[PDB]
Amino acid sequence: ASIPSSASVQLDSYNYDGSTFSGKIYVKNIAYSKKVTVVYADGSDNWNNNGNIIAASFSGPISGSNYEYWTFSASVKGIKEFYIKYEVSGKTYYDNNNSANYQVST
């Protein structure tokens, strides 16, 4: 969970308190306009054809790097796992934990 050397996007930290799912993401500043979303499987591990979606927003700079921070926070009915989807300059990038996805306990 460091400022990456080359990864296009990298989840840093996340929390789920029973209702609110939130976190912070390193995002390479490839171009100005960006869409950063969190796509998740619900409490029964249902990915629902990528239809469970939270929009992240720009949080702040990481000066001296080529990265910036984005954050998210939203209510969910339940969550077992998720990945980050990042669209910028006409291409899609993922942090899906090298295909394992990121897990939420319980």
Ligand X SMILES: OC[C@H]1O[C@H](OC[C@H]2O[C@H](OC[C@H]3O[C@H](O)[C@H](O)[C@@H](O)[C@@H]3O)[C@H](O)[C@@H](O)[C@@H]2O)[C@H](O)[C@@H](O)[C@@H]1O
Considering beta carbons, is residue 6 or 33 the nearer one to ligand X?
33
Backbone angle region of 48, left / alpha / beta, with phi > 0 → left and psi within -120 to 50 → alpha: left
Residues forming the site for ligand X (CB under 6 A): 29, 32-34, 57-58, 68
Q: What is the DSSP letter of 48?
A: G
Q: Two tokens at 60?
A: 């702040």
Considering beta carbons, is residue 63 or 99 the nearer one to ligand X?
63
What amino acid is encoded at 72 in this protein? F
Burial label for 92, CB within 10 Å (0-12, 13-18, 19+), is exposed
Q: Quote the least distance from Cβ 103 to ligand X, whole Å.
A: 27
Q: Quote the least distance from Cβ 7 to ligand X, whole Å.
A: 17
Are the CB atoms for 82 and 104 separated by under 8 Å? yes
Residue of minimal Cβ distance to ligand X: 58
Considering beta carbons, is residue 45 or 58 the nearer one to ligand X?
58
Q: Quote the least distance from Cβ 81 to ligand X, whole Å.
A: 26
